Amino acid sequence: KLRHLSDGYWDSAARLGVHGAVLQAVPGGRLSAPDGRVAVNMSSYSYLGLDESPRIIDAAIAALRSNMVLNSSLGRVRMTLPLLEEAECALGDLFGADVATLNSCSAAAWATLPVLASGLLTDGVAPVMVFDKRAHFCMASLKSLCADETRVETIRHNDVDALADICRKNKRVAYVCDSVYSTGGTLAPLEELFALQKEFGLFLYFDEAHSTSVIGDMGRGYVLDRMGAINDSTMLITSLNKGFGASGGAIVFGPRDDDRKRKIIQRSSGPLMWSQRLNTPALGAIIESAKLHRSEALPELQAKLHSNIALFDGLVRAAGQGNSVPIRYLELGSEVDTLEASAYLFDNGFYVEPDFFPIVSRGAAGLRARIRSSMSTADIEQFAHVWHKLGVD
Amino acid sequence: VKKLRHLSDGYWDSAARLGVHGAVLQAVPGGRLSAPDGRVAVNMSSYSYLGLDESPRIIDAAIAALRSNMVLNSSLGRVRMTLPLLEEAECALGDLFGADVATLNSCSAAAWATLPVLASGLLTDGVAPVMVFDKRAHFCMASLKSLCADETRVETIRHNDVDALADICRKNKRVAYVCDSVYSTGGTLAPLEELFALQKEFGLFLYFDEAHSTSVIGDMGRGYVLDRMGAINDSTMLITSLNKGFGASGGAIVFGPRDDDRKRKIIQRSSGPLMWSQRLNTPALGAIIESAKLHRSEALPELQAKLHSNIALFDGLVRAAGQGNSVPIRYLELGSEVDTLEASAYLFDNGFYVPDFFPIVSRGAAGLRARIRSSMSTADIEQFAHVWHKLGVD
Ligand SMILES: *Cc1c(COP(=O)(O)O)cnc(C)c1O
Ligand SMILES: *Cc1c(COP(=O)(O)O)cnc(C)c1O
């Protein structure tokens, strides 16, 4: 019955044109409506502006012109195009690990979490799957698929002490979490988790979707940066279209010289086997973005991002102020107030996506902003002016 | 189940050693593959049943959509807005199938996004139905039984047992049946007449997987179900793949009637991959639009005729499992896993790539899985038959 008012907001969101509408991509991180209104996108997941990189777009087209086919042997043969190998080898040199590409980070979780619960990745010993409470939904929805294979226990957020207790009462334990948490700005306790891993052999499973391109040298990620080189007990899934400037997702199996984890997941029954690989333009974009991630352009993009983050925090008060995570939340009074503010900001040249029930709790709606390197200093200052004029009048 | 892993992984290694599994080949015009060593072989196992993976109209449209939009993501920086290209793609598929259709990155993501919602009764008047899975149902759906078991009672009947399905329909209020429209292994089709009748009598929700029926079966390629059904109702749902014949990328959910938007909105606002998982990139959407327009032209009945012509030529020259079917999937039973891998290696070195073994198929039932397509020429099929017959002698 609670759906009575939940979907009631969705219809109010689609009516005002600030949710479920149609806008065109315009250079400069800008969206254009059919009527001619141009606004600056303040919620784009492309944290480095690589979705507008002319190098990446040309490489996607160049790969499609060369191979003259969309399928890289997806939904087809167990063979593979050289493009797909060059793509997974590019991600391999970038991350320093054995990497496989999939059509989405969600497909990576579907292909890894169950077989991880089977012990095939932990020397036949079925581990105890420990999920964080704030783990992403593409992983937590598969808890039952994991439960049919071993014991599943959900602990509260960053409860390192409760996790260590299960590591003492069981021989093999695994922890599934996010490297970077969007809602809350919290981070995975790497120092505490690497201590448990060095003692009990705790298996680590990180979702690096909000961590891949924005954190670490060469944009290797929060986990891979503070760790140095991945081991045989750490596994990463990530999305390659949120800051990486490409498409699909990837499984970061482990050590580059070790083919055992890739073989075990390949020959298992999962999306890595039956589902379709990425199309040629995505693979070409992955290659070019991997080369771009290894050049001096990426640390320059990270600097402009941190620069834009500091500018935003000094001009606008938002939940998450002071983070290194470029996600800010302008918590508004109600869902109706959330929708009307977005409509006002758009007519003055700024789109900010609205969150509400049931995505967020009742009475806790607001506008979800995301900071990217491609935003200019004038864009952020002008947004803070429009945001301040709304509050007063 | 734990000792057989020694003999199974031995077949994977041998298949990779012989070069017929997991090696790197380049796509060549004319349904062909090229090795780094210059060997060119005809691909006798492609899923592009109409040869639309080589269509210059579709390829050019995929390139055009990428230059025009100058971005890869169709979700406007992955926000909850959408590019006009995506609305045009779902509208093109909607005009083709005559139904309300949404696109996803894969047909697997469609099952992950629909089967839990259907099991919760949110699509069946709030009454949680009994999920009745077919035994031969695809793994992208069968692996989600536990996700459905948390929402309702889940049963698995034997293949096409319409009698056991009718019994569940009369012992429960609401019941749904998850199956494949066309089964690749076995050449078996769905009992639509019996299924439609149980739907008319009990209200049985029909959940079809048209992955091997789209483009290959029906006027304008609307699928096996939509051809014999006419127009979809509000108790039938389809999921399909757009790379196994449609000539593009990704998958799609065929919710129901074009006018009704309730099923689309229920799944969009539900905790499903249709919400958080990334949407198809621009070139995939540009290809979908062009293939949709191509499906509505006279070229598709022409390609369907060329396909059936090649099925008849193949069946008249090669004895294979499924001979006489209208589905372009043949299986050359060789039994021995070693004979299968060696037959594939011999055929490749003679110009034709075709192999299934344990654990993909049961032990002693290994063989070569061939797939007929419109892009195959008469000489391609005749020459393969000559090579396949000289393997029988020596
Ligand atoms: C091969 C096949 C699929 C493939 O799904 P994708 O993820 O799009 O590759 C889905 N369903 C059935 C019945 C199939 O045979
Ligand atoms: C956004 C996000 C994803 C997205 O996954 P895709 O399937 O690639 O769209 C996955 N995990 C987390 C933690 C995310 O924030």
Residue-range domains of chain B with CATH:
5-49+301-393 (3.90.1150.10), 56-295 (3.40.640.10)
Question: Is the beta carbon of B226 within 6 A of some atom in ligand 1?
Answer: no
List CB contacts (< 8 A) between A75 and chain B: 47, 241, 243-244
Q: How far apart are CA B101 and CA B280, in angstroms?
A: 14
CB atoms within 10 A of CB A102: 27
Number of H helices, E strands in chain B: 15, 13
| Beta strands A234-239 and A203-207, pairing class | parallel
Measured by CA distance, the residue closest to atom 11 of ligand 2 is: A209
* Strand positions, DSSP E, chain B: 26-28, 32-34, 40-43, 100-104, 130-134, 154-157, 175-178, 205-209, 236-241, 251-256, 329-335, 352-353, 366-371
Q: Are A49 and A374 in contact (CB under 8 A)?
A: yes
Q: Are A351 and A345 in contact (CB under 8 A)?
A: yes
List CB contacts (< 8 A) between A73 and chain B: 25
Does A197 show up as a binding residue in the annotation? no
Tokens 């540009």 belong to residue: B286
Residues in CB range of A267: below 8 A, 6 or more apart: A273, B8, B9, B12, B359
Q: Tell me, what DSSP letter sits at residue B190?
A: P
The strand pairing partners of A101, in sequence order, are A250
Structure tokens at A131: 């999920």
- CB-CB: which of A61, A241, A358 is closest to B78? A241
Structure tokens at A317: 């008060």
Q: How many residues appear in chain B?
A: 394
The strand pairing partners of B370, in sequence order, are B330
Q: How far apart are CA A237 and CA B257, in angstroms?
A: 37
Candidate of B240, B244, B288 to mutate for ligand 1, largest count of ligand atoms within 8 Å of Cβ = B244
Longest dimension (CA), chain A: 65
Q: Tell me, what DSSP letter sits at residue A328?
A: E
What does R_g of chain B's alpha carbons equal in angstroms? 22
φ and ψ at residue B358, rounded to 5 degrees: -65, 135
Q: How many residues appear in chain A?
A: 393
- CA torsion A151-A154-A158-A163 (nearest 10°) is -30
Q: Tell me, what DSSP letter sits at residue B235?
A: T
Q: Distances in Å between the alpha carbon of B245 and those of B217, B218, B229, B250? A: 11, 13, 21, 12
Binding residues of B for pyridoxal 5'-phosphate: 78, 107-108, 138, 212, 241, 244, 277-278
The closest of B219, B170, B215 to B327, measured between CA atoms, is B215
Q: How far apart are CA B22 and CA B44, in angstroms?
A: 16
The strand pairing partners of A40, in sequence order, are A30, A350
Q: Are A210 and A242 in contact (CB under 8 A)?
A: yes
Tokens 């293949």 belong to residue: B159
Question: Ligand 2 centre from A248 Cα, in Å?
Answer: 10
Q: Tell me, what DSSP letter sits at residue B158?
A: P
| Beta strands B40-43 and B352-353, pairing class | parallel
The closest of B255, B74, B267, B270 to A137, measured between CA atoms, is B270
The strand pairing partners of B178, in sequence order, are B133, B207
Q: How far apart are CA A29 and CA A27, in angstroms?
A: 6
Percentage helix, strand, coil, to 5, in chain A? 45, 15, 40
Residues in CB range of B301: below 8 A, 6 or more apart: B219
Q: Tell me, what DSSP letter sits at residue A180?
A: B
| Beta strands A128-132 and A173-178, pairing class | parallel
Q: Are B122 and B145 in contact (CB under 8 A)?
A: no
- CB-CB: which of A25, A70, A136 is closest to B62? A70
3-state secondary structure of B321: strand
Q: Are B78 and B278 in contact (CB under 8 A)?
A: yes
Tokens 């004895």 belong to residue: B319
Please give, rounded to a whole number of angstroms, the shortest distance from the CA of A332 to a CA of chain B.
19
CB atoms within 10 A of CB B116: 23
| Beta strands A203-207 and A173-178, pairing class | parallel
Question: Is the beta carbon of A73 within 6 A of some atom in ligand 1?
Answer: no
Q: Are A280 and A70 in contact (CB under 8 A)?
A: yes
| Beta strands A98-102 and A38-41, pairing class | unpaired
Amino acid of residue B11: Y
- CB-CB: which of A10, A43, A246 is closest to B72? A246
Q: Are B243 and A71 in contact (CB under 8 A)?
A: yes
3-state secondary structure of A208: coil
Structure tokens at B16: 């990779």
Q: Are A29 and A35 in contact (CB under 8 A)?
A: no
Question: Ligand 2 centre from A207 Cα, in Å?
Answer: 8
Question: Between B56-69 and B282-295, two packed helices, what is the crossing angle to 10 degrees?
Answer: 140
Q: Distances in Å between the alpha carbon of B235 and those of B174, B197, B206, B267? A: 11, 13, 6, 15
State which H helix or E strand residue B12 sits in: helix B5-17
Q: Cα–Cα–Cα angle for B11, B17, B21, nearest 5°?
A: 70
Q: Tell me, what DSSP letter sits at residue B206?
A: E
Return left, alpha or beta for B63; rule: phi > 0 is left, psi -120 to 50 is alpha, else beta.
alpha
Ligand nearest to the CA of B241: 1
Name the structure determination technique: X-ray
Q: How far apart are CA B3 and CA A335, in angstroms?
A: 57
Q: How far apart are CA B204 and CA B197, in angstroms?
A: 9
3-state secondary structure of B40: strand
State the closest ligand 2 atom to the C-alpha of B277, by its place in the atom list counted from 1.
Answer: 9
Ligand nearest to the CA of B280: 2
Number of H helices, E strands in chain A: 15, 14
List CB contacts (< 8 A) between A137 and chain B: 271, 276
Q: How far apart are CA A359 and CA A295, in angstroms?
A: 38
**Nearest residue of chain B to residue A136 (CA atoms):** B276
φ and ψ at residue B127, rounded to 5 degrees: -90, 115
Contact between B147 and A148 using a beta-carbon 8 Å cutoff: no
Q: How far apart are CA A89 and CA A250, in angstroms?
A: 12
φ and ψ at residue B132, rounded to 5 degrees: -110, 105
Q: Distances in Å between the alpha carbon of B185 and those of A113, B86, B200, B368, B384? A: 28, 34, 29, 12, 22
Contact between A353 and B80 using a beta-carbon 8 Å cutoff: yes
Q: How far apart are CA A251 and CA A239, in angstroms?
A: 9
The closest of B154, B281, B243 to B207, measured between CA atoms, is B154
- CB-CB: which of A10, A64, A285 is closest to B269? A10
Q: Cα–Cα–Cα angle for A275, A142, A95, nearest 5°?
A: 65
Q: Distances in Å between the alpha carbon of A81 and those of A283, A320, A335, B27, B226? A: 10, 43, 48, 7, 34
Question: Is the beta carbon of B340 within 6 A of some atom in ligand 1?
Answer: no
Assess whether the previous peptide bond of B359 is cis (omega < 30° from 0): yes
Q: How far apart are CA B289 and CA B293, in angstroms?
A: 6
- CB-CB: which of B8, B45, B243 is closest to A77? B45
CA B250 centroid distance within chain: 11
State which H helix or E strand residue A367 sits in: strand A366-370
Could you give the strand order of the β-sheet that contains B251-256, starting from the edge strand earlier in sequence? B100-104, B251-256, B236-241, B205-209, B175-178, B130-134, B154-157
Q: How far apart are the first and last CA of chain A?
A: 37
Q: What is the DSSP string of B95-134?
A: HHHTSEEEEES-HHHHHHHHHHHHHTTTTTTT---EEEEE
φ and ψ at residue A200, rounded to 5 degrees: -85, -5
Measured by CA distance, the residue closest to atom 3 of ligand 2 is: A209
The closest of B194, B264, B252, B267 to B221, measured between CA atoms, is B252
Question: Is the beta carbon of A366 within 6 A of some atom in ligand 2?
Answer: no
CA A278 centroid distance within chain: 17
Does A4 show up as a binding residue in the annotation? no
| Beta strands B40-43 and A353-355, pairing class | unpaired
The closest of B30, B67, B27, B65 to B51, measured between CA atoms, is B30
The closest of A247, A82, A207 to B106, measured between CA atoms, is A247
Which sign, positive or negative, has the C-alpha torsion B79, B80, B81, B82? positive
Interface mutation vs chain A, best among B24, B141, B215, B375, most A CBs within 10 Å? B24
Question: Ligand 2 centre from B73 Cα, in Å?
Answer: 14
Q: How far apart are CA B346 and CA B305, in angstroms?
A: 31
Does A76 show up as a binding residue in the annotation? yes
Structure tokens at B202: 């009990």
Ligand nearest to the CA of A272: 1
Question: Ligand 2 centre from A25 Cα, in Å?
Answer: 21
Question: Is the beta carbon of B134 within 6 A of some atom in ligand 1?
Answer: no
Question: Is the beta carbon of A104 within 6 A of some atom in ligand 2?
Answer: yes
Question: Between B56-69 and A54-67, two packed helices, what is the crossing angle to 10 degrees?
Answer: 180
Q: How far apart are CA B257 and CA A292, in angstroms?
A: 46
Contact between B143 and A145 using a beta-carbon 8 Å cutoff: yes
Ligand nearest to the CA of A270: 1
The strand pairing partners of A252, in sequence order, are A99, A236
CB atoms within 10 A of CB B235: 17
Q: Distances in Å between the alpha carbon of A115 and those of A192, A250, A343, B3, B8? A: 26, 16, 46, 17, 17
Q: What is the DSSP string of B267-292?
A: HHTSSSHHHHSPPPPHHHHHHHHHHH
Q: How far apart are CA A181 and CA A167, in angstroms?
A: 24
Candidate of B241, B242, B253, B254 to mutate for ligand 1, largest count of ligand atoms within 8 Å of Cβ = B241
Q: Are B214 and B241 in contact (CB under 8 A)?
A: yes
Q: Are A8 and B52 in contact (CB under 8 A)?
A: no
Structure tokens at A299: 């640390």
| Beta strands A24-26 and A30-32, pairing class | antiparallel
Please give, rounded to a whole number of angstroms, the shortest distance from the CA of A195 to a CA of chain B.
33
Question: Ligand 2 centre from A242 Cα, in Å?
Answer: 8
Q: How far apart are CA B78 and CA B69, in angstroms?
A: 15
Residues in CB range of A189: below 8 A, 6 or more apart: A158, A160
φ and ψ at residue A252, rounded to 5 degrees: -95, 95
Contact between A106 and B112 using a beta-carbon 8 Å cutoff: yes
Residues in CB range of B286: below 8 A, 6 or more apart: B61, B62, B63, B64, B65, B66, B85
Could you give the strand order of the β-sheet that contains A30-32, starting from the edge strand earlier in sequence? A24-26, A30-32, A38-41, A350-351
Does A105 show up as a binding residue in the annotation? yes
Q: How far apart are the first and last CA of chain B?
A: 37
State the closest ligand 2 atom to the C-alpha of A207, by its place in the atom list counted from 1.
Answer: 13
Give the residue ranges of DSSP H helices in chain A: 3-15, 54-67, 82-95, 105-117, 137-140, 143-147, 160-169, 190-200, 222-227, 260-266, 271-274, 280-293, 297-315, 335-347, 377-392
CA B62 centroid distance within chain: 21
Percentage helix, strand, coil, to 5, in chain B? 40, 15, 40
Could you give the strand order of the β-sheet that contains A366-370, starting from the edge strand earlier in sequence? A327-331, A366-370, A353-355
Please give, rounded to a whole number of angstroms, the shortest distance from the CA of B183 to a CA of chain A.
15
Q: Distances in Å between the alpha carbon of A32 and those of A25, A77, B64, B76, B204? A: 7, 41, 20, 11, 45
Q: Tell me, what DSSP letter sits at residue B24?
A: B
Q: How far apart are CA A334 and CA A373, in angstroms?
A: 31
